[PDB]
Design a protein around this ligand. Structure first.
Ligand code: ASP
Lengths: 160, 164
């Protein structure tokens, strides 16, 4: 009961910050995928094309976005989930790790000139599974957020 | 009212909630623009392949998927625009608009090039810089939004009025 307003401001700030860190992680993972495909385009070009020499710079740019993604994901993990958010957090964890590993595999395939393995990987499915996990998380987070900011949440939900 | 601790007036909740919904619809827009870029690049690389490579057969399906995701991006962006800005957000919203139209148009031109396999025109477009600019505008909008949101919820009069 005591200090309810202050606890509501801190928890609502946390839920927004957690969503923001997941947003950053998703966008950087998509950017990784983009940079990988740009590197693959250079590898498929003939040498005479000015843009073909950039294959390594482009693959390094994918490694950079992927590390940035993982940094934001770490930041997300640094904010303790609220009780009703635990399961959807753990679902993100599972799907994130799968997609992260997929992307690291794609980097390795291009680094070794294995363009066939690169195109064969079912990357889209892994992305879509993480996207679905993000959507479930967002639904849960928004239900909690609406209850907190409208004084319709019992104390147990705020880890009070 | 008391409506709630954070929003003494339920009108404050309307305003603050708008702000969040606007962010949400811009986040969606950006997501789907990036998905469009992915689908385009995955199409374009397959247009560089030999016909005999079985991986080339998806090039059209992927370009169709770009068209789908770009349409969805534009739907979200219209939703964003449908929500009246607060006056403190007008400037950053106009900045988003500038960068969004630049990148959107770029993506539509890429779809048009790939439609007949014009990989040269696709490559020559300086797409990355337009994407990067949109991403920076998005970041800036998000910073501004969050700061304003905190101002509203901690100000607590009732009080904030949408721009006309
Ligand atoms: N499998 C990779 C490369 C591709 O198929 O173009 C991806 O989906 O990003």
């Amino acid at each position: 009961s005591l200090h309810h307003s202050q606890k509501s401001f801190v928890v609502s700030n946390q839920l927004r910050e957690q969503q923001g860190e997941l947003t950053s992680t998703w966008d950087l993972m998509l950017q990784t995928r983009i940079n990988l495909s740009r590197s693959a385009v250079r590898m498929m070009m003939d040498s005479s094309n000015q843009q073909s020499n950039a294959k390594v710079e482009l693959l390094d740019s994918a490694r950079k976005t992927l590390a940035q993604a993982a940094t934001h994901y770490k930041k997300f993990k640094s904010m303790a989930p609220l009780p009703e958010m635990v399961a959807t957090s753990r679902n993100i964890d599972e799907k994130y790790k799968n997609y992260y590993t997929a992307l690291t595999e794609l980097i390795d395939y291009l680094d070794y000139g294995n363009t066939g393995a690169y195109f064969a990987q079912p990357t889209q499915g892994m992305q879509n599974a993480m996207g679905e996990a993000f959507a479930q998380y967002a639904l849960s987070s928004e239900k909690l957020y609406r209850d907190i900011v409208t004084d319709n949440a019992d104390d147990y939900r705020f880890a009070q």
